[PDB]
Design a binder for this molecule. Structure first.
Ligand SMILES: *P(=O)(O)OCC(C)(C)[C@@H](O)C(=O)NCCC(=O)NCCS
Lengths: 49, 134, 72, 50, 50
DNA sequence: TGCCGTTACAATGTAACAGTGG
DNA sequence: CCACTGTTACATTGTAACGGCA
């Protein structure tokens, strides 16, 4: 059980790392989508005028 | 019933206890007259090496007021005899200065725990505080 | 020195004295300790040093010298 | 959930520790009695393996 | 294993009794027939000594 | 209830350590 | 040095009071 728990801890660490990677990806996507919304707004405005 | 009772052992215990009490001056027998008491004590003294007859001796001449004390003494003797086999089941006796004991007993009564449980909890909390700081 | 632990415990676990054990000999057959006795010896060594020894490492202590070799 | 199992492992470890002192003390006590009883007492008299 | 364990104590007590009985004699017994011839020799020695 | 384990004491005896002064 | 004293950490035995259980 000691070896099993240590190995499960290592597996847990690996999944935590990959989800940290996904969190970073989400932040980058958030920046990109902010830019996209700005572009949409711009376009809208342009259309109106 | 947790500890099995052995006759040739508990009877020797009872004989030794009664001889000790008699040597200490306790009135072993129910006979106020000194002659009958001495005769019964002599019967007991010569009765050594006998469980099946020391039990009968107790049933017949034992002082009524010592029955409870003898019973609880034998209970404690049995428990200690069975617990003294293994280290973890033994008990360690210490002496505590009166203020320290007073505070510890105050805590134990307050929390409803025994002295052992109270000290175990306190030591665990001390270790936890160490880890908190460390 | 610290080896005085091992060379003591071994004797206390096998009935031999401090000098009786020879580094060239083997516990399994040259000391008279059978499987159970050797298990007891290794487990007492584990207890003394407040450490752990898995089965695999533990099986390589059949010789006298090994008892210190893994220790020091 | 797994931290609870880690604590249970610590409990099992302390139980193992306790059993280990019991066993080592038993063997320490045994040593001397074997040494004395090897004066032909243990050959067949005491060791009533039955 | 449990069947053998149940059988064990009887066999062990038997072995101990037989070993004591044979060692008391100069001979070591190995068969029921052999015990019978030992009985015959015992009878011969008895009928002589008497 | 009466037995039975269990706790928390009390009283006394000892070994071991630390002090103190001759 | 050495002896005698003070102290701590036990052991050993006994007892009263709770609480569980038939
Ligand atoms: P040997 O006749 O002295 O018997 C030794 C033994 C089988 C009783 C036992 O102590 C032993 O040596 N077992 C080998 C190790 C083992 O089985 N480990 C199990 C770990 S879960």
């Amino acid at each position: 059980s000691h070896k099993q728990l240590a190995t499960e801890q290592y597996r847990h660490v690996e999944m935590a790392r990959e989800l940290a990677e996904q969190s970073g990806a989400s932040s980058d996507l958030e920046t990109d989508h902010q830019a996209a919304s700005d572009h949409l707004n711009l376009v809208q405005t342009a259309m109106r005028q | 019933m947790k500890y099995q009772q052995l006759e040739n052992l508990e009877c020797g215990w009872k004989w030794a206890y009664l001889i000790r009490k008699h040597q200490e001056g306790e009135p072993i027998t129910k006979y106020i007259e000194n002659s009958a008491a001495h005769a019964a004590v002599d019967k007991l003294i010569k009765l050594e090496s006998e469980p099946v007859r020391v039990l009968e001796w107790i049933e017949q001449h034992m002082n009524p007021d010592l029955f409870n004390r003898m019973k609880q003494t034998i209970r404690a003797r049995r428990k200690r005899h069975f617990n003294a086999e293994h280290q973890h089941t033994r008990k360690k006796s210490i002496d505590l200065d009166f203020p320290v004991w007073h505070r510890l007993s105050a805590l134990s009564q307050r929390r409803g725990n025994t002295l052992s449980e109270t000290i175990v909890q306190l030591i665990e909390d001390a270790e936890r505080k160490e880890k908190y700081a460390n | 020195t610290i080896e005085e632990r091992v060379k003591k415990i071994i004797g206390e676990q096998l009935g031999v004295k401090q000098e009786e054990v020879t580094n060239n000999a083997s516990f399994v057959e040259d000391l008279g300790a059978d499987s159970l006795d050797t298990v007891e010896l290794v487990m007492a060594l584990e207890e003394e040093f407040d450490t752990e020894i898995p089965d695999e490492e533990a099986e390589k202590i059949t010789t006298v010298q090994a008892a210190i070799d893994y220790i020091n | 959930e797994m931290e609870n199992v880690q604590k249970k492992l610590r409990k099992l470890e302390r139980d193992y520790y306790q059993i280990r002192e019991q066993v080592v003390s038993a063997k320490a006590g045994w040593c001397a009695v074997m040494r004395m009883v090897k004066d032909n007492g243990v050959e067949r008299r005491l060791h009533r393996r039955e | 294993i449990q069947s053998l364990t149940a059988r064990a104590p009887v066999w062990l007590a038997a072995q101990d009794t037989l070993n004591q009985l044979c060692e008391q004699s100069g001979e070591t017994l190995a068969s029921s027939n052999d015990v019978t011839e030992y009985m015959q020799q015992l009878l011969e020695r008895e009928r002589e000594a008497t």
